[PDB]
């Protein structure tokens, strides 16, 4: 049994708002109409598409509630590039975190996969177009994102640079994924430009 679509696998897994449980393989349009509403890149896209073949049992679960961010703003992370019913929105399975009361404290969150299925976890980084944009969203001028599992180590830095406008935005979002094994934990640390997981996916092959 196959899965056919008019979206991208990226936009479907991220929860692109413009896009509305078992399969052998996935076949997608070469140029889907709904890919990344906010422009950017999805890392190791083909490896992920190949991994999502012959999957059995696929269920989205909430791993980091949007309501658990007490000292950052989880409600401001929307964009006119990602409209839903004529109002600005954003990918629904990750959270674009914003400073709160002109402050962006350092985030230190971990999530231990206490299920018995593999979890596909997605996160991202925001590359603003200029230094003034970086102040307005995150306050801290010089920022990082640190990600760690038992198999993975990321120490990222956003590139503040003006790009050509795509869907109105001259900045960019870049997304990453990993398979978190049962009883391993993913550790995040950031003082800005962090697109945090909210929903993850149980994977059985």
């Amino acid at each position, epitope marked *: 049994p196959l899965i056919l679509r008019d979206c991208s696998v990226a936009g479907w897994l991220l929860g692109n708002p413009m896009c509305d449980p078992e399969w052998s393989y996935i076949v997608e349009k070469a140029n889907p109409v709904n890919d990344l509403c906010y422009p950017g890149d999805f890392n190791d896209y083909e490896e992920l598409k190949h991994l999502l073949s012959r999957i059995n049992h696929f269920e989205k679960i909430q791993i980091i509630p949007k309501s658990s961010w007490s000292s950052h703003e989880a409600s*401001l992370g929307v964009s006119s590039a990602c409209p839903y019913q004529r109002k600005s929105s954003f990918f629904r399975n990750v959270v674009w975190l914003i400073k709160k009361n*002109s402050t962006y404290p350092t985030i230190k969150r971990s999530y231990n996969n206490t299920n018995q299925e593999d979890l596909l976890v997605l996160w991202g980084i925001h590359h603003p177009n200029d230094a003034a944009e970086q102040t*307005k969203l995150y306050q801290n001028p010089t920022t990082y994102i640190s990600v760690g599992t038992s198999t993975l180590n990321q120490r990222l830095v956003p590139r503040i640079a003006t790009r050509s406008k795509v869907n109105g935005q001259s900045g960019r979002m870049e997304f990453f994924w990993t398979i978190l094994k049962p009883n391993d934990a993913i550790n995040f640390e950031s003082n800005g430009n962090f697109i945090a997981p909210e929903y993850a996916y149980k994977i059985v092959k």
Partner: antibody
Amino acid sequence: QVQLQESGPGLVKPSQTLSLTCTVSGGSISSGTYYWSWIRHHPGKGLEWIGYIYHSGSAYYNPSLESRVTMSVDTSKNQFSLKLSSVTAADTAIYYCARAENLLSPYLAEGFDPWGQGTLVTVSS
Amino acid sequence: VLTQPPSASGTPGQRVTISCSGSTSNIGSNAVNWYQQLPGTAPKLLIYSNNQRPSGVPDRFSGSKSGTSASLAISGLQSEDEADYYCAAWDDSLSGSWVFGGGTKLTVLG
């Protein structure tokens, strides 16, 4: 129908601080993703945006006024407010509060709606 | 900051257009709004997102933008449309703010 009401008209002496408050009724200042804005009309000129503020505290100001401007929110009184320091006769204006209703980005909100009835502040010795 | 003709006029039933000239940093990069100020009242929103009307604003008011210029077209002109019309846009200069045109006083003749 959310409604906004500025505090009463008054005189401020040059170099003192102008303080105004907007009372919101018919809805919670902390409900929704709105920015709460101040806009003024200097007599015989146009409209000048002063800035706006989110209910949890972050604010954005017009760069020509930034150093003299501070706004704040009082969610318990359902109010937000404006302080403009070191005033001169150039700050004599009708001061309007308004709700920036439509978010286009985390800090860019458009569609000022509704507005208060303005309040006239005269700067004079 | 944005440039508007100080006056405009038309006779009832006509179509009148009000222009707004900006720069790359404001109209060229950002959504345009229009506000109507009737005599004795506060401004009210007429157009947001370049060409969208709020509830209660009829089709006769039409907003448009191209390049660094924006335009408001008022069809089926009525005597009650006498007002000052203001364009507005976010300006990217100096870390950003809303800016307004100087306003256009529209008179309906006859």
